[PDB]
Design a protein around this ligand. Structure first.
Ligand SMILES: CC(C)CN(C[C@@H](O)[C@H](Cc1ccccc1)NC(=O)O[C@H]1CO[C@H]2OCC[C@H]21)S(=O)(=O)c1ccc2c(c1)OCO2
Ligand SMILES: [Cl-]
Ligand SMILES: [Cl-]
Ligand code: NA
Lengths: 99, 99
């Protein structure tokens, strides 16, 4: 699809068996999801943005379905105000910015 | 252009006759730039990101070139960690997300 940017580019995702709404975010290096359980091991990480940093749990090799497209990668879990799909997974679904 | 996301989507902007680097950010509602001088009056704004909220200076109707495309619109100035071009100006330059 072609998504214009008049409104936030929100899509439905499936992660850990859960359906969620997330933001397709070209400014995010990483994918960051609101607090939830995921299987497997994790390690702590700090990520920073406007407003400063938050502590997250880093889970590797997590499968996510993004608007119907499957991708695998690292997912950070923590107290983000919004679910964010970052470049690590946008690349896998073939997303580009066009103008 | 068609910009892939394997690297940060950084472009050159020109504002106040100065070149700067900025991130094309579909996750940003607004455009936020590091401390600089802009003409005219400003108004207060609070913006919220990953780490919390910050105060910024809102300048309206600012002329800004983005990757060679002319835009005229609102620029927020404050302690952002990177210059971010948000959807208010991405729509002016005709940008879409495609996958
Ligand atoms: C600030 C940029 C460089 C990074 N951020 C991604 C942004 O797209 C962020 C994504 C975001 C969106 C909403 C709330 C919090 C974060 N947007 C944002 O802060 O936009 C602000 C300016 O316009 C306003 O509209 C949205 C909030 C304001 S982020 O959320 O802090 C972030 C995400 C993944 C990350 C990361 C930081 O570090 C490593 O991987
Ligand atoms: Cl990854
Ligand atoms: Cl590619
Ligand atoms: Na894992």
């Amino acid at each position: 699809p072609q998504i214009t940017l008049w409104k936030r580019p929100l899509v439905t995702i499936k992660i850990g068996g859960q359906l969620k709404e997330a933001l397709l975010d070209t400014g995010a290096d990483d994918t960051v999801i609101e607090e939830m359980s995921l299987p497997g091991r994790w390690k702590p990480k700090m990520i920073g943005g406007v407003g400063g940093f938050i502590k997250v749990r880093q889970y590797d090799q997590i499968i996510i379905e993004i608007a119907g497209h499957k991708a695998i990668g690292t997912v950070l879990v923590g107290p983000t105000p919004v679910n964010i799909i970052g470049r690590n997974l946008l690349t896998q679904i073939g997303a580009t910015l066009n103008f």
